[PDB]
Design a protein around this ligand. Sequence first.
Ligand SMILES: [Ca+2]
Ligand SMILES: [Ca+2]
Ligand SMILES: [Ca+2]
Ligand SMILES: [Cl-]
Ligand code: NA
Ligand code: NA
Ligand code: NA
Lengths: 473, 4
Amino acid sequence: VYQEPTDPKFPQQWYLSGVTQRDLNVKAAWAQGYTGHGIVVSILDDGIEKNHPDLAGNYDPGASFDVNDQDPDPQPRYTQMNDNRHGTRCAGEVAAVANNGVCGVGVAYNARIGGVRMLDGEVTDAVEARSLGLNPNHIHIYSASWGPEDDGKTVDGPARLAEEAFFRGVSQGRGGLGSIFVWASGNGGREHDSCNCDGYTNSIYTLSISSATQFGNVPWYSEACSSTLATTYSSGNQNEKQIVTTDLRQKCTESHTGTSASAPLAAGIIALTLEANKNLTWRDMQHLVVQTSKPAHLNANDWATNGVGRKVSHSYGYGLLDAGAMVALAQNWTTVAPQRKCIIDILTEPKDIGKRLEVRKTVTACLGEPNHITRLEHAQARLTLSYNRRGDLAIHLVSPMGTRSTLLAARPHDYSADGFNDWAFMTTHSWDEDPSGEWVLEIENTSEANNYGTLTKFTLVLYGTASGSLVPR
Amino acid sequence: XXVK
Ligand SMILES: [Ca+2]
Ligand SMILES: [Ca+2]
Ligand SMILES: [Ca+2]
Ligand SMILES: [Cl-]
Ligand code: NA
Ligand code: NA
Ligand code: NA
């Protein structure tokens, strides 16, 4: 009979378990025997207090490095403001020690936990790449609660070294099964930011994770976009509880908040899932998330049923992670087929955008060829366009099965005249659909201003397979 | 950039 943790703050970890069903169903995974034994998670952040009384027992120097100062020791830099507490807070969410009379517990409280000190300094492309590419045959899961500015006007993604690190990780990392990269989708809600304008979250190689408040609402800080895959609980208003974790200076906090707290909880759940099946590939893990995540009782006004019967929201992806369902489905999971990539260059000539542009194209999705896709995973609309005020644009993509993805919503603060330069807007919302047939791209001016520009390239990039479908939900 |  499984005995739940006795830690003093565990009863305040409302998001892990409860009679109420507003939780991530983590105790159900623990009771199946999965606590993270043998799995290695690394927090890429401002350091990790490796001697914290709730982290030391799980700390793993092999999962750690200090990229900012070029040494092995990721200990945070102590200041009066406690600026560099952020990584320690994230680490305790994943892997705080259980049943030790200190603070609460991690989701994967028997996993090994490390930290890369890489935010406490100038975060160059090289710094990111050395962090994403750290010890990729030892570290299983990387968690990143940072990214481009959330001012609602930035379009920014991994530069060359960082992108190379993503590809090397998913291709050769973890014995060829692929590094698992977990990303916080962003804090730009107040600025009406779009997490598709962030190349880290928008990447197919990252599991981008959004947030829900305790009462099941879209937090003030949440960014909506089509690249988000799923959700975990985080903070909300001041009547709603927050996240309990290890804090700097060997303390415990019950007030960890924002997008930052959601990715580590997902990383912990993924750690439990990998313990249940160590042979899972990076793509397998995204399939498991798609199939097991739960929309129920998450409030949003944009819930839509996609072509295979799954509910999907731009605020929540496929919904809340469900650890018990993840570990259960992982155990007998059949590895997915190798990833195929079908490239469809849509335009025969540039198109003036004006007030509204609709581009319709019927595609065969590489019929007759070895990259024929009948089962979509990610889809990208790689767009090159000029426009005089970028944030007045709204961009939608409709799949042949009728699923309307918002690739870009209006961004009031985005005054840029720089347009998009082959920007690979990504959607997860057509996962498992057949992509053969008519795709529709819609670009519209959401403002009354007389804006002007031209779409010069639209590449539809489809990823996926040609086998193994489930009966639609 | 990169912000926490
Ligand atoms: Ca150091
Ligand atoms: Ca503890
Ligand atoms: Ca953002
Ligand atoms: Cl590719
Ligand atoms: Na591989
Ligand atoms: Na992603
Ligand atoms: Na079709």
